[PDB]
Design a protein around this ligand. Structure first.
Ligand code: A1IF8
Ligand code: CL
Ligand code: CL
Ligand code: MG
Ligand code: MG
Ligand code: MG
Lengths: 226, 244, 250, 195, 241, 195, 243, 125, 204
C-alpha cells in the first residue's frame, strides 16, 4: 500500500495505489483503498485491511448520526478524535493506519492516524510500505501555494514512486479531490499504467476435455404451488 | 416508595383466577376473528382484518397471518405489536432447533416454548401479559397436520377446527355443525369463509377485509407448501365459493 | 435511589382496555394535523409548523425528519416524544441493519423497529407509552414507495393516503375523494396542500407548512461524484419558496 | 483410550473399543467399556484425555435421556450427532476444551438405515461407512478400503473387525487389552460377549 | 388519582407532574429576557436580594456553561444548579469526544432530551426550571435556545421567561414588527444591553438600580457576566437619553 | 528534546519538532508544546499515542475545572498529569514537563518522569536529547534571567541536544508565558546550528 | 391531595411538601449560627442540657471537613453527620486529583448537588437539617447556609433552628453597624451573645455554648474549636449583655 | 428485578396468595391416585366442554418424570409444565451424580421444595 | 498446529457471460491421514452460493450460522438475500470475532436476481472483502489456484467453456497440494438453472 494526502490553495487531495496482497501474492489487482467516512471526508488505509475497513465504516456511521443530531456538516477533527480514542482503547491490536482528509465548514483538513492512536498534521503526508518512496517525491517537489492541478500531479507522482519502487504497491492510481464549496470528486483509476499485454495464446479448451462422474440439477427456487 | 403505584399484574383473585389474564382475554374477544380448520390433506387459516379503510394498502399489509418457518404459520388475535414480539422469538427457537439438531422443529415443541414464555409473564416479573392469542397451523413428520391455540395464560390445546378473537361462541357452534374428519382442504376453505361470513360484525364479507393461508402437501411430491393468499386470490376464492 | 419501578405502568382494565395507550391516543388527537399521500412515483408527508411564539424561529424545529436517505417521518402529538424517537430510529437503522448488511433498511423493517421501541414502552417497567403517532414515508429497491402509520400501541399499517391528529376525521374523508392509483407526485403535493388548508386557522404559506417528499434520486444532494451506483437521497424537504410557488396554482 | 473403531454394514453399525485404561507405566484396568447408550438405537464410543471422556459421555447421555422423556420420542442418529458436534464446537473455544473424540453408531427407525458418525474434539463431523480415532485409523482405514462392501451382513461385519483387531495387535506398540464389540440394529444395542 | 403524582397520562392525555413543574418555574418570581445583536447575544434577569444577611455576589441565576455558552435559569436554584452542573459536564465531554466546542442549540437539544426522559420515566421527577442558552455560534451566529420541563426546545429571535413573560414577549414582538429584522441592529453589545434593560423597564413598569439586575453577554468566543459597576455605567447611559 | 525555564517575567517552554518511528523521521515539523489552559502548557516526550491520549484527557479535566472553580493553578495541572501517569504507569511511556504563569506564584515548572512522581524545579530538561545537555544546562542556568537570556539559554541547550541526538531535530519551537500572555517563537536550522 | 405523601412529587402549587416538612424537623432543632469576619468565619451552636448526666464539653456538635472547613447544623443530628461524612469524601477526592484543599464555593456545591439529589426520587427522604459551614480558601473567607431543598447562598451571617428569628435580628444589626467588617476575636464574643439571646426561645432547659472558628491571622486558616480562657472570656461577655 | 412480596401474612396468620392458589386447584379438573398391592393407578377427569379437540396432540394430564415415576395434577395447566420440566431435569441430574434414579419420595420432596420457594420469594406468586 | 491447514481443501469461483461457477475438492484429512471423500465445501441459501475452506468444524459452524441468518432475513424481508448483501453479512459476521476468528477462507458466488449481473467475492478470516471481477481462490492450494486461474481464465466465457476452465484450474491446482483433491464438485450457475457436476480426478 502507498497512500498520500496533499493540501492546496482551496482544498486537500488524497491518492492511493490499487494492489491488495496476501503475503507475496496479489489478491486484488484493482482494489480500492480510498474510503468515504462522510460525503466530503475521505480517508485511505494501510495495515490489516479488515481493521482499516471496519474502523472507517464504524466512524463513518457514528459521524452520520452525529451530523443528523447536530444538523451540521460533519467536521474532520471529529472523525480524527473518534478514530484516535477507538484505536488507543485497543492498544495497537486494531492495525489501522489512515490518512484522513476532508473539507468542512472550518475549511480543508489533512491528518494521519497510527494503530496505537497517535495523530499527525501536515501539508503533505504518506503511509504504507510505499511511504518512504512517496515522501521522497513529496519532499523534492512540494511548495506552498499549490493549485488543484499541481496537487493532483504531486499526489499521483508520489503514488507512482510507490507503484514502481515498492513491491507492496502496484497497479493504478486512485485520487479524491475535496475542494472548499464544491462536491468531493472521486477519480477511481485516475492513472492506468499497468495494463497486462495480450497473452500469446487462448487456453479456452475443447468441451469434453474434462472427465465427469455425475451430473444433476440443483433447485435454487422455493417450493412451488399445487 | 414505588410500591404505591404497583398494579401487581401476577396475583390470584380470591376465586383463584389471574386478573390480568382474564382482562387480556376480554381484550382479545374484541379483536378480528381468526379461524383454523384442519383437513386430511392440509390446514386452512382465515382471519378478518378490523374495520379497514378504502385507503389502506391491502397487498403490502399483514396484521393477521405470519410465517414462523416454511412448515408452520400463526393466526393472531389481539395487540399486533405484542404478537410481533412473540413471532420474532418463535422464529428464533425454530432456527435454533434447526441449527442444533439439523431438523425442522416439531410444531408442538415451538408451541410449548411460546406458551412457556407467556406463562412467565403470569407468574413473575411484574409486567402485563401479552394481549395475544395464536392459531398455530403446522406440519412435521411425527403428527402430520397440527392446529394449536395459545392465550395470555400460556395454556395451549390441539384442535380439528377452532376460532379466536370476536364471536368465538357463535363461530365454534357453526364449525361444530359442519366439520367432519374426512374433510378436504377445498371443503375446509369453504367452511372457514361461511363461518366468518355469518359471525362478521360487517355488513358483507369482501376480499379487502380478509387474510387467508393454506398449508398443503399440495407441493410436488413428499413436501409441504405454505400459501399466504394475495388480495386477487382471496377475491377469486370468494366468487368460487359464491359469497360475492 | 435505583429505578424501583420494575412493574408495568400500563395494565389491562376489567373492560380489556389498556388505559395508558387509549390516553396516549387522546394526546395524539389534540396534536396538530399531519398527513401522508402516496403517488405512483413518490410519497408526500406534510404538517403545520404551529409556532408557539412569533419570536420563535420555527425553522429550528424539525417536525419532518430524515431517518435514512430514502425515508422521512412526520408526527402528531408530543414533539419531545417524537424527537427522541427520531434519534433512536436513526441509530437502529445503523446498529440492527446498516452495520450488518451494508445497506439502509427497507421502509417496512425500519417501521417494524420503531414499532418495537413503542411496544416496549407499553409493557416495560417504569415507563409510559409514547404520546405520538408517526407517518413514515420511504422507498427501497424491492418494495418501491411506501407510507406507514405507527400508533402509541406499536401497531403499524400501510396507507395509500391518511391523516392523524386534530382534523384527521375530516382530512381522511377529503383524501378518499381525491386519491386514485394513477396520481403523479406533483398531483399528490397539490392535494396535500389543499387537505392541509382545511385544518389550519391563521397564516397558510411556506413558513407555517413543513412538507417533504420521497421521490427521484437527488445526485445534486449526494455531496460527492465518481461512484455511478450512488445516485443520492430520495428524501427531500421542500423549501419555503418551493411551497409558495405551488400555493399560487391552488 | 487409543482404540475406537466403527463399521456400518447393511442393517447394523458395529462399535469396537479397547478395554485398557493405562496411567503412567501401569494398566489399572483391562475391562473398560468406552461407550454410553444415548438412546435405545444410538450408541456413542469415546477416547481422549482422562476424566474428560466420561464427563462428556455422561453429560451427552443425560441431555438425550432428558429430550426423550420431555418429547416421549427418540431423536434420530443424525439429530443426536448434530447435537453432539455443536457441543464439541462450543467446547473448542471454552476456557478448558473437552479433549474427547467420539464415534456415534445408531439405527434410524424412520429410514430403516444404520448410520456411523465420526466427530473429533474440534467438532469435525462426517458420516462414514467405517471410522476410527487416533492411531488405529493409520492401519484400519486402508484395510477396510480393500475388504469393505456396503451390502455386508453383521456376521461379515464382525469378521472384518476381527481382521482390524489382529492387524492392530500385530503392529501397534501398546497393549490395548482387546476390544468390547456392540451391534446397533433395528432391535437396539447388544454386546458381543466372545471376541 | 395517582396519574397526578407520577408522569403517566391522565384520561385527557396530560402529564400533571410536567404542568406542576412549569408552575415551580415561577417560584423565584424573577423575569429573564434575551435578545440578539449583530455580533452578540444579551441575557438580562431580575436580581432580588430580600435578606440583608445574604452575600449578594453569590445570588445568581446566570451560569457560564463553557467558554462560548451562557445559561440563565427561571426556577428554584437547587434544580437550576443541577441543570448547570449537567450542561458543564456535557459541553466538556462533547469537546473531548468530537474535537470542537458544543454548539448552543445542540446542548439545548441534549438538555431537552434529558428533560424528555423525566416525563417518560416514573422514578425521575421533571426539573422545575426553564433553561435559556445563549452564545455566538461559529456556524449559526447569535443564538437563543430555550428548554422547559416538557422536554421542548426551540430557537428564538428574542424570548422572555418568568411571571410577566407575556408583557415582555409582546413588548419585544412590537419592536420587531417595526424594525422588520430578527435582531438589534447595533455594533456594540453595550447598546444591545441598554436596549435589553430599556425594553424590560417599559414592560414591567419598574426602574432599576445596579443591584436589581444581572447581565450576561455572549460574543464570538467568550460569554461573560457584568459587574454591578458595569451595569451602573449601562443604567447611566440609558438615563442620559 | 524538551525543557522549561522559570525566569523574572514568567516561564519559557522549548522543544524540537521530530517524531521518529525507529530511525525514520515520521514528521520533522511537529508541535510538542500543547496548551492545557490559557497560560499553562505541557511539553510531551515518550510514545506519540500515550502522550497525546493523556494531554487530551488533561485538557478535558481543566476545561471542566474552569467551568466549576475558575482558573486552576499550574500545580493543579501537574497533579492531574501525575495522577494519570502514576495510576497507569504499567501501560504508559510518557515523560511530561508542565509550565504555567498565574499572577500570584508567577512562573512555575513541574516535571513528571516515567514513574509518575512530580518534581517542582527552577528548570527541567527531558526526552532522549536531554542526557547530552545536563552538563551545559547546569553550568549555564541562573535564577532571575531576562526573557532574552532565557530564550537564549534554551536555544543553545536544545541546539546541542539536536546536534548529538539522532532522536531530535527540525525547528526549535518555544512558548513564552508572561503577564502579557502567550508568545510563540520558532528557530530554524540555519539560525541555531551555527551557534 | 396525596401530594405530600411521597418525596419528589410536585403539588399543584409547584412545591415539594416532603422538603417543606423536612424544614419543620429543622425549625424544631437547637439554634446554630455563622458570622463571616475580616479574614475568617465563626460558628456557634446551642447544646441543650437535657440532664445533669450529660458530660460537659463531651457531645461536640460542630464538625471539621478537611482541615479548613467548619460545618454546624440544626435538625436531626444524624442527618447532619451523614452530610459531613459525604463532604469529607468530596473534599478528599477533590484534594486527591487537584492537590489544593477544596475551595469553599466548590465544597458548598458538592453538598448542594448531594442534598438536591435527595429531592429527585421517592425512594429517599430529604435531609432533616439546615447546615451552616465555611472557611478560608485562596480567595479569603466565605460563609454558606444550605437547606433541605438543596438551596444555599453566601451569607455575611446565618442562623437556623428554633431561635433563628432572634439571631437573624442580632446579625442584621452587626451588618448595619460594621460595614468595614468585624474581627475574628470580636465575632467570637458576638457569636456567644447571639446564642445567649437566641436561647430565650428554648429557655426551659439550660444550655452549653460551643464556638469554633477559621481565621487567616488567628488560626492560620485552619478550623479550631474555641476552648479554655477565650471561651470563658466569650461566655463572660455574653452573660454581661443579657443582664 | 421485580422484588415485590406478593405472598405476605394477614392479621389472622394466613397467606392469602397460597390460599387463592388452592382455589385455582379446586377449579381444576379432578385427579385421583389409588395404590394397589403391586401397582398405582392415576385417574384424571377431562371436562367435555371442549369437543372438536385433537386428542392425539393435546397435552395429556399424566406426565412421565422418569421411566418409573409419573406426575398428574389439578390447577393451572401452564403452571404444571414448569413443575414437570424442573422435575424431569432433577431426575436426570440425580442419575448423573448418584448413579441411581430418584426415589418417588425424593422427586416429591424436590417438587414440594420448588412450590414452597415460590411462597417466600419476592416477585413471584 | 496451523488451524487453516489441518483438514485441507480448496474452493475457486469464476464469472462468465451472464453466469458464474464455484467448485471445491471433497477431501477432509487429519493432516497426512485422509478421513472423508464426501466433505463438500459449497452450500447455498436461495440463489446465493457460499464455498468455505479452512478448519472443517468452522466450515460446518459458519454454514449452520448463515443458514440461520438467511432464513430469518427471508421471513422479515419477504425475499431471498442477494449476493452483494450476503457478502456484507459474511464480512460483518467474521469481523464480530476479530480477536477469536473462524479459521476459514469463504467465497461467495451467485447472480443478482434483479440486475442479472454475475457476482463473486472472497474474504480473509476476519471478513476483509476481495471483490475481483475475474476469479476468487481459497484453501491450502491457493498459490496454485492463483497460477492456474491467472493463466487459464479469459472474460465472458459461455457456461460450458467456463465449466472446462474452472474444472482444469481446480484439478491441476489440487494435484500439486498434498492436502487437497480426493474428488471435486463444480456448480454452473445461470439466472434460473444450476448444474452440479462431480469431476473424475486422481485419488492420491
Ligand atoms: C526529545 O528528547 C525528543 N526525542 C524524541 C522522542 C522519541 O523522545 C520524543 O518523545 C518523540 C516526540 C513525541 C511526538 C508526539 C508528541 C509527543 C512527543 N516521540 C516519538 O516520536 C515517538 C517515540 C517512540 C519511542 C520514544 N514516536 C512514535 O510514537 C512513533 C509515532 C508513530 F507513529 F509513528 C509510531 N511511533 C512509534 O514509535 C511506534 C511504536 N512505531 C514503531 O515503533 C515502529 N514504527 N511504526 N508504526 O520526543 C522527545 C521529546
Ligand atoms: Cl502505531
Ligand atoms: Cl440525547
Ligand atoms: Mg474427524
Ligand atoms: Mg492432492
Ligand atoms: Mg495420497
Amino acid at each position: 500500500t502507498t497512500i498520500v494526502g496533499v493540501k492546496f490553495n482551496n482544498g486537500v487531495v488524497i491518492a492511493a495505489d490499487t494492489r491488495s496482497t496476501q503475503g507475496p501474492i496479489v489478491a486484488d489487482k484493482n482494489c480500492a483503498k480510498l474510503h468515504r467516512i462522510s460525503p466530503k471526508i475521505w480517508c485511505a488505509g494501510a495495515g490489516t485491511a479488515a481493521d482499516t475497513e471496519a474502523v472507517t465504516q464504524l466512524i463513518g456511521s457514528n459521524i452520520e448520526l452525529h451530523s443528523l443530531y447536530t444538523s451540521r456538516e460533519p467536521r474532520v477533527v471529529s472523525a480524527l478524535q473518534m478514530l484516535k480514542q477507538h484505536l488507543f482503547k485497543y492498544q495497537g491490536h486494531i492495525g489501522a493506519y489512515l490518512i484522513v482528509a476532508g473539507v468542512d465548514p472550518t475549511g480543508s483538513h489533512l491528518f494521519s492516524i497510527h494503530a496505537h492512536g497517535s495523530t499527525d498534521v501536515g501539508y503533505y503526508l504518506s503511509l504504507g510500505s510505499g511511504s518512504l518512496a512517496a515522501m521522497a517525491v513529496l519532499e523534492s517537489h512540494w511548495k506552498q501555494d499549490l493549485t488543484k492541478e499541481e496537487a493532483i500531479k504531486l499526489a499521483s507522482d508520489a503514488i507512482q514512486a510507490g507503484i514502481w519502487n515498492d513491491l507492496g504497491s502496484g497497479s493504478n492510481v486512485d485520487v479524491c479531490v475535496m475542494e472548499i464549496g464544491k462536491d468531493a470528486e472521486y477519480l477511481r483509476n485516475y492513472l492506468t499504467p499497468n495494463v497486462r499485454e495480450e497473452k500469446q495464446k487462448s487456453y479456452k479448451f475443447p468441451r469434453g476435455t474434462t472427465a465427469v462422474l455425475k451430473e444433476s440439477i440443483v433447485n435454487i427456487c422455493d417450493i412451488q404451488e399445487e | 416508595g414505588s410500591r404505591r403505584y404497583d398494579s401487581r399484574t401476577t396475583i390470584f383473585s380470591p376465586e383463584g383466577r389471574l386478573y390480568q389474564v382474564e382482562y387480556a382475554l376480554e381484550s382479545i374477544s374484541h379483536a378480528g376473528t381468526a379461524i383454523g380448520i384442519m383437513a386430511s390433506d392440509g390446514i386452512v387459516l382465515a382471519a378478518e382484518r378490523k374495520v379497514t379503510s378504502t385507503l389502506l394498502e391491502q397487498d403490502t399489509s399483514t396484521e393477521k397471518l405470519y410465517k414462523l418457518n416454511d412448515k408452520i404459520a400463526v393466526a393472531v388475535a389481539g395487540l399486533t405489536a405484542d404478537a410481533e414480539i412473540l413471532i420474532n422469538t418463535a422464529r428464533i427457537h425454530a432456527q435454533n432447533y434447526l441449527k442444533t439438531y439439523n431438523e425442522d422443529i416439531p410444531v408442538e415443541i415451538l408451541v410449548r416454548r411460546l406458551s412457556d414464555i407467556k406463562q412467565g409473564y403470569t407468574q413473575h416479573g411484574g409486567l402485563r401479559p401479552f394481549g395475544v392469542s395464536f392459531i398455530y397451523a403446522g406440519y412435521d413428520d411425527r403428527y402430520g397436520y397440527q392446529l394449536y391455540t395459545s392465550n395470555p395464560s400460556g395454556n395451549y390445546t390441539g384442535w380439528k377446527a377452532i376460532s379466536v378473537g370476536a364471536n368465538t361462541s357463535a363461530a365454534q357452534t357453526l364449525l361444530q355443525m359442519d366439520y367432519k374428519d374426512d374433510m378436504k382442504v377445498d371443503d375446509a376453505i369453504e367452511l372457514a369463509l361461511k363461518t366468518l361470513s355469518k359471525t362478521t360484525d360487517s355488513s358483507a364479507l369482501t376480499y379487502d377485509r380478509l387474510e387467508f393461508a393454506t398449508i398443503r402437501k399440495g407441493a410436488n411430491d413428499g413436501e409441504v407448501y405454505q400459501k399466504i393468499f394475495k388480495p386477487q386470490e382471496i377475491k377469486d376464492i370468494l366468487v368460487k365459493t359464491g359469497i360475492t | 435511589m435505583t429505578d424501583r419501578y420494575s412493574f408495568s405502568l400500563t395494565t389491562f382494565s376489567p373492560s380489556g382496555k389498556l388505559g395508558q395507550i387509549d390516553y396516549a391516543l387522546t394526546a395524539v388527537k389534540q396534536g396538530v394535523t399531519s398527513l401522508g399521500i402516496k403517488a405512483t412515483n413518490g410519497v408526500v408527508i406534510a404538517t403545520e409548523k404551529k409556532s408557539s411564539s412569533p419570536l420563535a424561529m420555527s425553522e429550528t424545529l424539525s417536525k419532518v425528519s430524515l431517518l435514512t436517505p430514502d425515508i422521512g417521518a412526520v408526527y402528531s402529538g408530543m414533539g419531545p416524544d417524537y424527537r427522541v424517537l427520531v434519534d433512536k430510529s436513526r441509530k437502529v437503522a445503523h446498529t440492527s441493519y446498516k452495520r450488518i448488511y451494508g445497506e439502509y433498511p427497507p421502509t417496512k423493517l425500519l417501521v417494524s423497529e420503531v414499532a418495537k421501541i413503542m411496544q416496549e414502552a407499553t409493557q416495560s417497567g417504569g415507563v409510559r407509552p409514547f404520546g405520538v403517532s408517526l407517518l413514515i414515508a420511504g422507498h427501497d429497491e424491492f418494495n418501491g414507495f411506501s407510507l406507514y402509520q405507527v400508533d402509541p400501541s406499536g401497531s403499524y399499517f400501510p396507507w395509500k393516503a391518511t391523516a392523524i391528529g386534530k382534523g384527521s376525521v375530516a382530512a381522511k374523508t377529503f383524501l378518499e375523494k381525491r386519491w386514485n392509483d394513477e396520481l403523479e407526485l406533483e398531483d399528490a403535493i397539490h392535494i396535500a396542500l389543499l387537505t392541509l388548508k382545511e385544518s389550519v386557522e391563521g397564516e397558510f404559506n411556506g413558513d407555517t407548512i413543513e412538507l417533504a417528499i420521497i421521490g427521484d434520486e437527488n445526485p445534486d444532494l449526494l455531496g460527492y461524484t465518481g461512484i455511478p451506483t450512488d445516485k443520492g437521497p430520495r428524501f427531500r424537504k421542500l423549501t419555503s419558496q418551493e411551497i409558495n410557488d405551488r400555493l399560487e396554482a391552488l | 483410550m487409543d482404540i475406537i473403531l466403527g463399521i456400518r454394514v447393511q442393517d447394523s453399525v458395529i462399535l469396537a473399543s479397547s478395554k485398557a485404561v493405562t496411567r503412567g507405566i501401569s494398566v489399572l484396568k483391562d475391562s473398560d467399556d468406552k461407550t454410553r447408550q444415548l438412546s435405545p438405537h444410538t450408541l456413542m464410543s469415546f477416547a481422549g484425555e482422562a476424566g474428560d471422556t466420561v464427563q462428556f459421555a455422561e453429560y451427552i447421555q443425560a441431555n438425550i435421556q432428558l429430550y426423550s422423556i420431555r418429547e416421549d420420542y427418540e431423536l434420530s442418529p443424525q439429530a443426536v450427532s448434530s447435537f453432539v458436534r455443536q457441543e464439541l464446537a462450543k467446547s473448542i473455544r471454552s476456557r478448558r476444551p473437552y479433549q474427547v473424540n467420539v464415534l456415534i453408531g445408531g439405527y434410524d427407525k424412520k429410514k430403516n438405515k444404520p448410520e456411523l458418525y465420526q466427530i473429533d474434539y474440534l467438532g469435525t463431523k462426517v458420516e462414514l461407512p467405517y471410522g476410527a480415532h487416533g492411531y488405529s485409523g493409520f492401519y484400519t482405514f486402508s484395510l477396510l478400503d480393500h475388504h469393505y462392501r456396503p451390502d455386508m451382513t453383521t456376521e461379515e461385519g464382525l469378521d472384518l473387525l476381527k481382521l482390524c483387531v489382529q492387524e492392530l495387535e500385530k503392529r501397534m506398540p501398546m497393549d490395548f487389552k482387546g476390544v468390547i464389540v456392540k451391534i446397533v440394529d433395528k432391535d437396539g444395542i447388544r454386546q458381543v460377549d466372545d471376541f | 388519582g395517582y396519574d397526578r403524582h407520577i408522569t403517566i397520562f391522565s384520561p385527557e392525555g396530560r402529564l400533571y407532574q410536567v404542568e406542576y413543574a412549569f408552575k415551580a418555574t415561577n417560584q423565584t418570581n424573577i423575569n429573564s429576557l434575551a435578545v440578539r445583536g449583530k455580533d452578540c447575544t444579551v441575557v438580562i434577569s431580575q436580581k432580588k436580594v430580600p435578606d440583608k444577611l445574604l452575600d449578594p455576589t453569590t445570588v445568581s441565576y446566570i451560569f457560564c456553561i463553557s467558554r462560548t455558552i451562557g445559561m440563565v435559569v427561571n426556577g428554584p436554584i437547587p434544580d437550576a444548579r443541577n441543570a448547570a452542573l449537567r450542561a458543564k459536564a456535557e459541553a466538556a465531554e462533547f469537546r473531548y469526544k468530537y474535537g470542537y466546542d458544543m454548539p448552543c442549540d445542540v446542548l439545548a437539544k441534549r438538555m431537552a432530551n434529558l428533560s424528555q426522559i423525566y416525563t417518560q420515566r416514573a422514578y425521575m421527577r421533571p426539573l422545575g426550571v426553564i433553561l435559556t442558552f445563549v452564545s455566538v455560534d461559529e456556524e449559526l451566529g447569535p443564538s437563543i435556545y430555550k428548554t422547559d420541563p416538557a422536554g421542548y426546545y426551540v430557537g428564538y429571535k428574542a424570548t422572555a421567561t418568568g411571571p410577566k413573560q407575556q408583557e415582555i414577549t409582546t413588548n419585544l414582538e412590537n419592536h420587531f414588527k417595526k424594525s422588520k429584522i430578527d435582531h438589534i441592529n447595533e455594533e456594540s453589545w453595550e447598546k444591545v444591553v441598554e436596549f435589553a434593560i430599556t425594553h424590560m423597564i417599559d414592560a414591567l413598569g419598574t426602574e432599576f438600580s445596579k443591584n436589581d439586575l444581572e447581565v450576561g453577554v455572549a460574543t464570538k468566543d467568550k460569554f461573560f457576566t457584568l459587574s454591578a459597576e458595569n451595569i451602573e455605567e449601562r443604567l447611566v447611559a440609558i438615563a442620559e437619553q | 528534546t524538551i525543557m522549561a525555564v522559570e525566569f523574572d517575567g514568567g516561564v519559557v517552554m522549548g522543544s524540537d519538532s521530530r517524531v521518529s518511528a525507529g530511525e525514520a523521521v515520521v514528521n520533522r515539523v511537529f508541535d510538542k508544546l500543547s496548551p492545557l489552559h490559557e497560560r499553562i502548557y505541557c511539553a510531551l516526550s515518550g510514545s506519540a499515542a500515550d502522550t497525546q491520549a493523556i494531554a487530551d484527557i488533561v485538557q478535558y479535566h481543566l476545561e471542566l475545572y474552569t467551568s466549576q472553580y475558575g482558573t486552576p493553578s499550574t500545580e493543579t495541572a501537574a497533579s492531574v498529569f501525575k495522577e494519570l501517569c502514576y495510576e497507569n504507569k504499567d501501560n504508559l511511556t510518557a515523560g511530561i514537563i508542565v509550565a504555567g504563569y498565574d499572577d500570584k506564584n508567577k512562573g512555575e515548572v513541574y516535571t513528571i518522569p516515567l514513574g509518575g512522581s512530580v518534581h517542582k524545579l527552577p528548570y527541567a530538561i527531558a526526552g532522549s536529547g536531554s542526557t547530552f545537555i545536563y552538563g551545559y544546562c547546569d553550568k549555564n542556568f541562573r535564577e532571575n534571567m531576562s526573557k532574552e537570556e532565557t530564550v537564549d539559554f534554551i536555544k543553545h541547550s536544545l541546539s546541542q541536544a539536536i546536534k548529538w541526538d539522532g532522536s531530535s531535530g527540525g525547528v526549535i519551537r518555544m512558548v513564552v508565558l508572561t503577564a502579557a500572555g502567550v508568545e510563540r517563537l520558532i528557530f530554524y536550522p540555519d539560525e541555531y546550528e551555527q551557534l | 391531595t396525596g401530594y405530600d405523601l411521597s418525596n419528589s412529587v410536585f403539588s399543584p402549587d409547584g412545591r415539594n411538601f416532603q422538603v417543606e416538612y423536612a424544614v419543620k424537623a429543622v425549625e424544631n432543632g437547637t439554634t446554630s449560627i455563622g458570622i463571616k469576619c475580616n479574614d475568617g468565619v465563626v460558628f456557634a451552636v446551642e447544646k441543650l442540657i437535657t440532664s445533669k448526666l450529660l458530660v460537659p464539653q463531651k457531645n461536640v456538635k460542630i464538625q471539621v471537613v478537611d482541615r479548613h472547613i467548619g460545618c454546624v447544623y440544626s435538625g436531626l443530628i444524624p442527618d447532619g453527620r451523614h452530610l459531613v461524612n459525604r463532604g469529607r469524601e468530596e473534599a478528599a477526592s477533590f484534594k486527591k486529583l487537584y492537590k489544593t484543599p477544596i475551595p469553599i464555593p466548590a465544597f458548598a456545591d458538592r453538598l448542594g448537588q448531594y442534598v438536591q439529589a435527595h429531592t429527585l426520587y421517592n425512594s429517599v427522604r430529604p435531609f432533616g437539617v439546615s447546615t451552616i459551614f465555611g472557611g478560608v480558601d485562596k480567595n479569603g473567607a466565605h460563609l454558606y447556609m444550605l437547606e433541605p431543598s438543596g438551596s444555599y447562598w453566601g451569607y455575611k451571617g446565618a442562623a437556623t433552628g428554633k431561635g433563628r428569628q432572634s439571631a437573624k435580628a442580632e446579625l442584621e444589626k452587626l451588618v448595619d453597624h460594621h460595614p468595614e467588617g468585624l474581627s475574628a476575636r470580636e465575632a467570637v464574643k458576638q457569636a456567644a451573645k447571639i446564642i445567649y439571646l437566641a436561647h430565650e426561645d428554648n429557655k426551659e432547659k439550660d444550655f452549653e455554648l460551643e464556638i469554633s472558628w477559621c481565621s487567616l491571622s488567628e488560626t492560620n486558616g485552619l478550623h479550631k474549636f474555641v476552648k479554655g480562657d477565650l471561651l470563658q472570656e466569650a461566655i463572660d461577655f455574653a452573660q454581661k449583655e443579657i443582664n | 428485578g421485580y422484588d415485590r412480596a406478593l405472598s405476605i401474612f394477614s392479621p389472622d396468620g394466613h397467606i392469602f396468595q397460597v390460599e387463592y392458589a388452592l382455589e385455582a386447584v379446586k377449579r381444576g379438573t379432578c385427579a385421583v391416585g389409588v395404590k394397589g398391592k403391586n401397582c398405582v393407578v392415576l385417574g384424571c377427569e377431562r371436562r367435555s366442554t371442549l369437543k372438536l379437540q385433537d386428542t392425539r396432540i393435546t397435552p395429556s394430564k399424566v406426565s412421565k418424570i422418569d421411566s418409573h415415576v409419573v406426575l398428574s395434577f389439578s390447577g393451572l395447566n401452564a403452571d404444571s409444565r414448569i413443575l414437570i420440566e424442573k422435575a424431569r431435569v432433577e431426575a436426570q441430574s440425580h442419575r448423573l451424580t448418584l448413579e441411581d434414579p430418584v426415589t418417588v419420595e425424593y422427586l416429591t420432596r424436590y417438587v414440594a421444595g420448588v412450590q414452597q420457594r415460590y411462597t417466600q420469594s419476592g416477585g413471584v406468586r | 498446529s496451523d488451524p487453516s491447514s489441518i483438514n485441507g481443501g480448496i474452493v475457486v469461483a469464476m464469472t462468465g457471460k451472464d453466469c458464474v461457477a464455484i467448485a471445491c475438492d471433497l477431501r477432509l484429512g487429519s493432516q497426512s491421514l485422509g478421513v472423508s471423500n464426501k466433505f463438500e465445501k459449497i452450500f447455498h441459501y436461495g440463489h446465493v452460493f457460499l464455498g468455505i475452506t479452512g478448519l472443517a468444524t468452522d466450515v460446518t459452524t459458519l454454514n449452520e450460522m448463515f443458514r440461520y441468518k438467511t432464513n430469518l432475513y427471508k421471513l422479515k424481508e419477504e425475499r431471498a438475500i442477494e449476493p452483494e448483501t450476503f457478502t456484507q453479512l459474511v464480512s460483518s459476521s467474521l469481523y464480530e470475532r476479530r480477536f477469536g476468528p473462524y479459521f476459514v477462507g469463504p467465497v461467495v458466488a451467485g447472480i443478482n436476481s434483479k440486475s442479472g449481473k454475475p457476482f463473486i467475492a472472497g474474504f480473509d478470516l476476519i471478513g476483509c472483502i476481495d471483490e475481483a471481477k475475474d476469479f476468487i481462490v481459497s484453501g491450502t492450494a491457493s498459490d496454485q489456484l492463483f497460477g492456474m486461474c491467472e493463466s487459464l481464465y479469459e472474460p465472458n466465457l459461455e457456461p460450458e467453456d467456463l465449466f472446462e476452465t474452472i474444472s482444469q484450474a481446480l484439478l491441476n491446482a489440487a494435484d500439486r497440494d498434498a492436502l487437497s483433491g480426493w474428488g471435486a464438485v463444480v456448480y454452473i450457475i445461470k439466472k434460473d438453472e444450476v448444474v452440479k457436476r462431480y469431476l473424475k480426478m486422481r485419488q492420491d
